[PDB]
Amino acid sequence: GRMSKFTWKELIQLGSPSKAYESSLACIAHIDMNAFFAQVEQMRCGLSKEDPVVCVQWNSIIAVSYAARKYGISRMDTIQEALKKCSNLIPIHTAVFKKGEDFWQYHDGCGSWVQDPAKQISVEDHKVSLEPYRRESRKALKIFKSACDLVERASIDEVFLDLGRICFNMLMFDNEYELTGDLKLKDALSNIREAFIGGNYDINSHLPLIPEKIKSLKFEGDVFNPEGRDLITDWDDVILALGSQVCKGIRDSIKDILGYTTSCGLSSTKNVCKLASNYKKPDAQTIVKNDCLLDFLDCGKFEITSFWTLGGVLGKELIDVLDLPHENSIKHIRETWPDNAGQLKEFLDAKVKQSDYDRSTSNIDPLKTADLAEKLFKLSRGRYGLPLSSRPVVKSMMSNKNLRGKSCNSIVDCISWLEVFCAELTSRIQDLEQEYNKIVIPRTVSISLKTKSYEVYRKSGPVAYKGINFQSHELLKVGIKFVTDLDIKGKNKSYYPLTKLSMTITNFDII
DNA sequence: GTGGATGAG
DNA sequence: GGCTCATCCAC
Ligand SMILES: Nc1ccn([C@H]2C[C@H](O)[C@@H](COP(=O)(O)OP(=O)(O)OP(=O)(O)O)O2)c(=O)n1
Numbered sequence: 001g002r003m004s005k006f007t008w009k010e011l012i013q014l015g016s017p018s019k020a021y022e023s024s025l026a027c028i029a030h031i032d033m034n035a036f037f038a039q040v041e042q043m044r045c046g047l048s049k050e051d052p053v054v055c056v057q058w059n060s061i062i063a064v065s066y067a068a069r070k071y072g073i074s075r076m077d078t079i080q081e082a083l084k085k086c087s088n089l090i091p092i093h094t095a096v097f098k099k100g101e102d103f104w105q106y107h108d109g110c111g112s113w114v115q116d117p118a119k120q121i122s123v124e125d126h127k128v129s130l131e132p133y134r135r136e137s138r139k140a141l142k143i144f145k146s147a148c149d150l151v152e153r154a155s156i157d158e159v160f161l162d163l164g165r166i167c168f169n170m171l172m173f174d175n176e177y178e179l180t181g182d183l184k185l186k187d188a189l190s191n192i193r194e195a196f197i198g199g200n201y202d203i204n205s206h207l208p209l210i211p212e213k214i215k216s217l218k219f220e221g222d223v224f225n226p227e228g229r230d231l232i233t234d235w236d237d238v239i240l241a242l243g244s245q246v247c248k249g250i251r252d253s254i255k256d257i258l259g260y261t262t263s264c265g266l267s268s269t270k271n272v273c274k275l276a277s278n279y280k281k282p283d284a285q286t287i288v289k290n291d292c293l294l295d296f297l298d299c300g301k302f303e304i305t306s307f308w309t310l311g312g313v314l315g316k317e318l319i320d321v322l323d324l325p326h327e328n329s330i331k332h333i334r335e336t337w338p339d340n341a342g343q344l345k346e347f348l349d350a351k352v353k354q355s356d357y358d359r360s361t362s363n364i365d366p367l368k369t370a371d372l373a374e375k376l377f378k379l380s381r382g383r384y385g386l387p388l389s390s391r392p393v394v395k396s397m398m399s400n401k402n403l404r405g406k407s408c409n410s411i412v413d414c415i416s417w418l419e420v421f422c423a424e425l426t427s428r429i430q431d432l433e434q435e436y437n438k439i440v441i442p443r444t445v446s447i448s449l450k451t452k453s454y455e456v457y458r459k460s461g462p463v464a465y466k467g468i469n470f471q472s473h474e475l476l477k478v479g480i481k482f483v484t485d486l487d488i489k490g491k492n493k494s495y496y497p498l499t500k501l502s503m504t505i506t507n508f509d510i511i
Numbered sequence: 512g513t514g515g516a517t518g519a520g
Numbered sequence: 521g522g523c524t525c526a527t528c529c530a531c
């Protein structure tokens with residue numbers, strides 16, 4: 001007591017873009033668009049957020065609006081099943097490419113669920129286009145980057161934000177913000193601000209106890225506080241409070257510009273944010289204070305298999321290995337080794353040197369069992385902070401069509417599909433340049449397919465650009481040759497009807 | 512050198 | 521259940 005637990009070094013780190021995630025006062029955020037595809041189709045057709053709309057692909061549902069979820073409809077239910085749950089369901093099929101044409105289109109009012117035999121989208125000669133979701137995604141991304149100086153795109157509809165710089169500056173220099181009436185952050189946070197500019201402190205000194213007045217700062221969103229704890233006790237709570245405020249603005253910016261609802265999760269770690277953002281949906285914001293991490297991790301909805309990269313076999317193994325139960329496993333891993341990663345480390349090292357398994361059907365890499373320990377240790381305590389890295393440069397881009405029926409039955413048929421794959425790849429190449437803001441062009445194409453008997457043929461080679469680097473024509477030119485050379489390689493062999501056909505581009509010159 | 516595994520969208 | 525993405529490694 002009589003002094004804040006944290007130090008200046010830790011608070012200042014929020015200003016550094018490369019060392020802000022390690023800080024204890026770190027304020028990360030994860031934002032996941034609710035029923036994305038379902039939402040975008042809703043917005044496109046000018047429907048309301050409460051409409052039972054659903055994104056359809058062929059016969060399956062790939063996106064379920066929360067409005068339609070009240071009818072018990074779930075992802076991947078066949079349209080037929082859904083309609084038996086909500087006869088007033090509003091199914092919308094994704095845009096599609098028609099064999100031969102170089103552009104995708106929306107066939108609203110058409111679908112397998114439609115009686116009229118004319119209005120149909122035969123999967124036989126159609127390719128799903130995900131471009132619409134791409135664009136919208138790209139938009140939300142530009143708004144995110146304009147509000148935060150560090151955004152990690154985890155997926156097509158997910159992003160992580162490092163509110164470090166914002167919270168810090170807001171904490172030390174914002175003079176507009178109001179907490180209540182006749183009270184501003186500047187006057188409520190005088191000591192700390194006046195001690196900061198003074199700079200008569202040592203980076204390793206401890207921060208002054210938060211001012212009794214700052215406790216009137218309110219959190220924006222749901223603060224996961226089951227054990228009914230004090231919302232504001234130290235700076236991490238202040239930083240988190242401001243963070244939640246700032247965060248609300250950004251999200252609203254999205255609902256206002258694009259009209260997409262979202263769920264968000266704040267905490268001092270990417271992993272906890274990931275869980276928090278999923279805790280409540282739709283259009284919510286779960287806030288996990290550091291002093292509520294365990295209460296949260298032990299609420300009863302998570303498991304070791306509920307964390308990141310552990311929801312698969314690697315997860316089901318760690319259970320049968322560490323001899324973990326099937327309930328309150330996170331609280332377990334924590335209590336069986338409440339000293340340090342070393343405890344659990346030597347436990348694995350000892351559990352791997354016996355007649356329990358072989359180094360073949362296992363997912364653990366013994367020479368790295370030291371990390372696995374430190375990881376699980378931290379994860380079980382909600383302190384495994386990963387840096388908000390950036391998505392690595394793209395290596396390749398494929399565009400295929402798992403052929404069904406006698407669609408691709410000849411060479412021209414192959415070509416017709418090639419036209420589609422190029423139109424799409426070309427489209428995706430532009431989207432790439434927009435992200436890297438640098439010219440991107442494939443230096444090599446590749447054609448592969450699967451014969452009637454499922455055999456694999458494939459020709460790879462370099463694509464040459466001469467004139468205006470038309471990465472939307474010469475690409476197809478090479479594709480045709482290749483698909484034609486393969487047509488010759490299998491003349492009196494099992495070949496047509498092809499069962500699969502795909503075009504891929506690699507070796508990119510990010511000049 | 513890749514078809515599968517693995518994990519999540 | 522359909523289909524897109526990004527490692528990583530025995531055979
Ligand atoms: N097996 C899956 C999982 C997801 N998606 C698509 C549907 C969504 O538009 C986008 C989003 O991924 P989510 O898993 O986050 O799906 P939702 O947006 O539908 O629901 P929620 O926001 O509750 O996660 O990816 C898909 O085609 N196939």
Ligand SMILES: [Ca+2]
Nearest residue numbers: 032155158278
């Ligand atoms: Ca998700």
Ligand SMILES: [Ca+2]
Nearest residue numbers: 032033035157
């Ligand atoms: Ca989502």
